[PDB]
Amino acid sequence: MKNIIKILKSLSMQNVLIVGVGFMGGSFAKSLRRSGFKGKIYGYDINPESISKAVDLGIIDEGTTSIAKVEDFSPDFVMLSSPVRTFREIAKKLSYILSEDATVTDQGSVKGKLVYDLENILGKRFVGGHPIAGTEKSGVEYSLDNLYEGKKVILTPTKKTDKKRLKLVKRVWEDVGGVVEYMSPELHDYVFGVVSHLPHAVAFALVDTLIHMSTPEVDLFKYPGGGFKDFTRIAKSDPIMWRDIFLENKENVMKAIEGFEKSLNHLKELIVREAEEELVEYLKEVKIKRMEI
Amino acid sequence: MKNIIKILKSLSMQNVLIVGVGFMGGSFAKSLRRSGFKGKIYGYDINPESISKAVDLGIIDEGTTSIAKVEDFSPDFVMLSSPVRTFREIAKKLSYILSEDATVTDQGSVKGKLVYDLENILGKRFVGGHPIAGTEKSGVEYSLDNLYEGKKVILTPTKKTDKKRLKLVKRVWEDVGGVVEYMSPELHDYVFGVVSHLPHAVAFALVDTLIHMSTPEVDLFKYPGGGFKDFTRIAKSDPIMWRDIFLENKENVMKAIEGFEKSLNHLKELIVREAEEELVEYLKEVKIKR
Ligand SMILES: NC(=O)c1ccc[n+]([C@@H]2O[C@H](COP(=O)([O-])OP(=O)(O)OC[C@H]3O[C@@H](n4cnc5c(N)ncnc54)[C@H](O)[C@@H]3O)[C@@H](O)[C@H]2O)c1
Ligand SMILES: NC(=O)c1ccc[n+]([C@@H]2O[C@H](COP(=O)([O-])OP(=O)(O)OC[C@H]3O[C@@H](n4cnc5c(N)ncnc54)[C@H](O)[C@@H]3O)[C@@H](O)[C@H]2O)c1
Numbered sequence: 001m002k003n004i005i006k007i008l009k010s011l012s013m014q015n016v017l018i019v020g021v022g023f024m025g026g027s028f029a030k031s032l033r034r035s036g037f038k039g040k041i042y043g044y045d046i047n048p049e050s051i052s053k054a055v056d057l058g059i060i061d062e063g064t065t066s067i068a069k070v071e072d073f074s075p076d077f078v079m080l081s082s083p084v085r086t087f088r089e090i091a092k093k094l095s096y097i098l099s100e101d102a103t104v105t106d107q108g109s110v111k112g113k114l115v116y117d118l119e120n121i122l123g124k125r126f127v128g129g130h131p132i133a134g135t136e137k138s139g140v141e142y143s144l145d146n147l148y149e150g151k152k153v154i155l156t157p158t159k160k161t162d163k164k165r166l167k168l169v170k171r172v173w174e175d176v177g178g179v180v181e182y183m184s185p186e187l188h189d190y191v192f193g194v195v196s197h198l199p200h201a202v203a204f205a206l207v208d209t210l211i212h213m214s215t216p217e218v219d220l221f222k223y224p225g226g227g228f229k230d231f232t233r234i235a236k237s238d239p240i241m242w243r244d245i246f247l248e249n250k251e252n253v254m255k256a257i258e259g260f261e262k263s264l265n266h267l268k269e270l271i272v273r274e275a276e277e278e279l280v281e282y283l284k285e286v287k288i289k290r291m292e293i
Numbered sequence: 294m295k296n297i298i299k300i301l302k303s304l305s306m307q308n309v310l311i312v313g314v315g316f317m318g319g320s321f322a323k324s325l326r327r328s329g330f331k332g333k334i335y336g337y338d339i340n341p342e343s344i345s346k347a348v349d350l351g352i353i354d355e356g357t358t359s360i361a362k363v364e365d366f367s368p369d370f371v372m373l374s375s376p377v378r379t380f381r382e383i384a385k386k387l388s389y390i391l392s393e394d395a396t397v398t399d400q401g402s403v404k405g406k407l408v409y410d411l412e413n414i415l416g417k418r419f420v421g422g423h424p425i426a427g428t429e430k431s432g433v434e435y436s437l438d439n440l441y442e443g444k445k446v447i448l449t450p451t452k453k454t455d456k457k458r459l460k461l462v463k464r465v466w467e468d469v470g471g472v473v474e475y476m477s478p479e480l481h482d483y484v485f486g487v488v489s490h491l492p493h494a495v496a497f498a499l500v501d502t503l504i505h506m507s508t509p510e511v512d513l514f515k516y517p518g519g520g521f522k523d524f525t526r527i528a529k530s531d532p533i534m535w536r537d538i539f540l541e542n543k544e545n546v547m548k549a550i551e552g553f554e555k556s557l558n559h560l561k562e563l564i565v566r567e568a569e570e571e572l573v574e575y576l577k578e579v580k581i582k583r
Contacts, residue, residue, distance in 0.1 A: 132519060152516070187511065194506050196519025201560060202495055203524055207579050208556040213487050213549070218480070221583040225425040225444060226402075226489025227496075227527050239576035246564050246572065256506070257561060261554075263501040267494055268550060271539050279539065283532035286500040290528045293517060 012168055013103070014039040017075035018060060019090055020082025021050040024107050024134075026143025028079050029059045031176040034145045042073040045082075054140045071097045077172075080106035084114060085244045091121045098125065103165045105129050109196075109241075110248045111156045112189035119160050127169040128156040128185060130192070131178060136236035149177035156185040193252030198260055200242060201253060203234035305396075305461060307332045310368035311353060312383060313375025314343045317400045317427060319436025321372050322352045324469035327438040335366040339375075347433045364390045370465075373399035376537040380407060384414045391418065396458045398422050402489065402534075403541040404449045405482035412453050420462045421449040421478060423485070424471060431531040442470035449478040486545030490538060491553055494546060496528040497535075 016032065018025040021043040029041050043054050043063030051063035064070065067090070078094065080087050087108060094104065105127040108114065115128035132152040153173045157166050170180045183191065210220045210228070224232060246253055270279040309325065311318040314336040322334050336356030338344050344356035357363065360383070368391060373380050380401060387397065398420045401407070408421035426444035428435070446466045450459050463473045476484065499521065503513040539546050563572040 132516065191511065191513060191516055192519055194503060195513050195516045195521045198502065199499055199519075199521045199524050202499060202557070203520075204576055204579065205553060205557040205560050206492060206495060208559070208575060209491070209549075209553045210487065211578060211581070212556065213552045218484065219583060220484060220488045223425065223445070223484060223488045226485055227492040228488050230523055230526055231492055233523055235579045237576075237579060239573050239579070242576050243569065243573045247567055247569075250564055250567075253564060254561065256502070257557065259506045260498060260502045261557075263498040263505065264494070264550065264554075266501070267498050267539075268547070271543055271546060274540055274543075276536065276540070279536040280532045282501070283497060283535050285504070286497050286528050287530075287532060289504060289514060290500045290525055292514065293522075 010038070013037075013077045013172070015073055015075045016041045016077045016079065017070065017073060018043045018054075018063075019045075019078060019080045019094075020086070021045040021054045021060065021063060021140055022081065023137045023139055023142050024131075024147075025079065025081030026054060026057075026059050026140035027133075027145070027147035028081060028107065028176075029054070030143055030145035031148055032172075033059075035175040035177075037175075040073070042070075042075060044070050050140055057140065059140060059143060067093045067097075070094070074099070076102050078102065078104040080104065080108065083241065083244055084108040084110055084248060087114065088117055088121065091118050091126075095121055095123075098122075100125075103127065103168060105165075105169045107131055109134075109192070110189060110245055111154075111183075111185040112249060112252070113185070114248065115156050115158070115185040119158065124160070124162045125165070127161060127165050129169060129173070130154045130156070130188065131173070136233075136238075138238065146177065148173070151178055153178040153180050154183050154188055155180060156183055156188050158185065189249050189252045190255070193249055193256040194259070197245060197249055197253045198256035200234065200237065201246070201257060202260065203231050204242070206231050207234060302461070302464060303331065306330070306370045306465070308366055308368045308370070309334045310363065310366060310371040311336045311347075311356075312338075312371060312373050313379070314338045314347045314353065314356060314433050315374065316431045316433065316435045317424075317440075318372065318374035319347060319350075319352050319433035320426075320438070320440035321374060321400065321469070322347070323436055323438035324441055325465075326352075328468045330468075333366075335363075335368060337363050337366075339379075343433055350433070352433060352436070360386045360390070363387070367392075369395045370461075371395065371397045373397065373401065376533050377401040377403045377407065377541050378537040381410060381414065384411055384419075388415055388418075393418075396420065396461055398458075398462045400424055402485065402538050403482060404447075404476075404478040405542065405545075406478070407541060408449050408451065408478040412451070417453075417455045417458070420454060420458050421481075422462060422466070423447045423449075423481065424466070425489075426471075429527055429529040431534065439470065441466065444471055446471035446473050447481055448473055448475050449481050450475060451478065482542055482545045483548070486542055487549040487552065490542055490546045491549035493527055493530065493535060494539070494550060495553065496525045500525050500528045 043060040054060045119126045336353040347353045397418045424446045507513045
């Protein structure tokens with residue numbers, strides 16, 4: 001009698017649309033299936049090969065490249081997984097196709113104003129999210145059915161978020177193994193501006209530095225074993241994605257670089273003043289914090 | 294020809310002194326012993342714990358915390374492996390205590406004027422070296438008997454360098470796995486200023502940024518490897534080692550940081566001014582084959 005928590009659960013989400021059928025879109029589709037989801041998974045992509053590869057791999061049941069065909073799929077759950085620069089335009093087009101009862105959510109690596117813009121486009125259907133997962137992979141062929149297990153997923157509810165959709169999006173992420181927490185859109189963009197965007201910005205600029213400080217007689221790239229090695233991981237990054245993340249989170253990325261410049265300026269001062277003991281303590285305190293994890 | 298070359302090497306290294314018995318001094322001691330070396334290995338260190346640990350692990354035959362006692366060791370081959378600013382005053386002491394025929398070399402991460410200062414203190418005894426190998430760990434407990442295997446070692450001979458000792462030091466490094474090349478002391482300090490000292494300075498400051506940008510309600514350290522973790526492994530390195538390197542190589546470290554800043558400033562402006570094409574071109578630089 002009371003056990004019918006089960007039926008509500010099955011009826012809460014029946015036709016799922018993956019927008020952007022790439023690595024993240026496909027890892028989500030796969031992880032969703034692996035958690036025992038029995039409904040339909042549909043794909044929408046501008047690249048018909050993304051759809052082609054995902055269907056034959058069994059990752060979606062069917063898909064399309066015409067936005068207007070999406071309507072035939074009557075999705076009630078949408079996971080935005082294209083580049084974040086596409087989200088506004090696509091959400092414009094979903095806003096008419098989707099029933100008032102649909103839920104839209106996303107995996108976008110930036111939140112901030114984008115969440116407010118998406119909720120204004122989509123009314124009440126929208127819940128912002130960011131799974132702190134990722135690797136340096138692209139394309140559905142690389143999608144993993146456990147990408148999210150044991151990782152943080154940040155949802156960014158507002159005063160406008162629908163509590164039952166927030167709660168569903170939370171539960172769907174936990175079914176795939178994620179650990180959910182909440183941050184405002186603005187706090188999210190500050191936090192990840194600092195812990196994620198800044199570190200990439202600074203790896204980018206390091207590479208640029210070794211290029212202009214090399215001379216015709218000296219290729220500095222020949223000497224990676226002195227500390228530069230870990231920074232060369234930046235070679236695996238996608239320049240277009242970073243370009244878009246930098247632009248979209250510009251105000252937080254600039255604040256983060258600013259606080260970085262303050263830290264580096266402090267280190268220069270200790271160096272030039274030969275502050276022997278201060279310099280040790282500066283390095284010791286960063287040592288301890290970095291070791292905690 | 295091999296027999297003899299080997300005899301000569303043996304005889305010229307009966308008594309090795311490791312000065313600073315920590316991660317690099319221990320790695321050197323273990324590497325030498327793994328390579329089949331048969332003489333004595335002694336340790337001298339300011340920390341008595343460094344000595345007893347190294348003895349207990351069978352890394353050195355014997356050691357001491359008194360520089361005077363080094364004379365009883367009659368070292369003929371000394372590998373300086375303490376923090377780089379300890380070298381001058383240690384050398385001064387050694388010059389009285391070591392025989393004229395001994396070789397003194399080093400593992401320090403800075404060369405530059407220190408090579409010259411050390412040649413003036415030690416005379417013909419001295420050969421400047423720097424193995425480009427290490428991790429963030431420090432202390433003899435972390436040392437490894439294959440640390441230098443297949444790694445570059447830079448020697449910095451000058452006008453004044455004794456050729457026999459240069460050949461000796463080179464073959465010792467190649468014996469433990471290293472691949473030797475030469476640079477001038479000054480070229481060394483500019484190369485490694487940019488490629489090793491600046492990336493460390495950058496990693497340290499990155500972690501420091503998360504400290505001050507944190508609030509009591511938001512601990513930025515709860516969110517690591519949004520990529521931070523990968524780029525700051527080297528910010529767990531030793532504060533004394535790194536304080537010494539930054540001060541000893543101060544002018545190059547400043548020149549490297551100034552270079553970096555101009556790159557960072559270029560990047561900022563591309564971001565601020567939303568230059569889609571130029572920004573993506575700048576970022577594409579990580580794809581270069583070098
Ligand atoms: N890669 C990561 O480490 C990572 C981590 C966390 C979050 N994210 C987020 O995941 C999203 C996509 O990332 P990905 O790594 O899967 O990229 P991806 O390259 O693997 O795939 C994106 C897919 O979107 C499709 N696409 C591109 N433009 C489109 C448009 N106009 N309409 C519909 N589809 C379009 C592509 O054709 C491709 O099939 C981004 O929003 C990114 O911020 C990525
Ligand atoms: N750690 C690395 O990656 C690495 C790589 C290449 C070169 N180096 C250079 O190696 C040398 C040793 O570094 P490490 O990583 O072995 O450091 P470490 O902390 O592991 O060891 C340093 C040792 O020297 C001792 N010491 C400190 N002051 C001394 C003094 N006044 N006299 C005698 N001993 C003293 C300490 O007690 C300790 O046992 C430094 O010059 C460093 O720049 C380090």
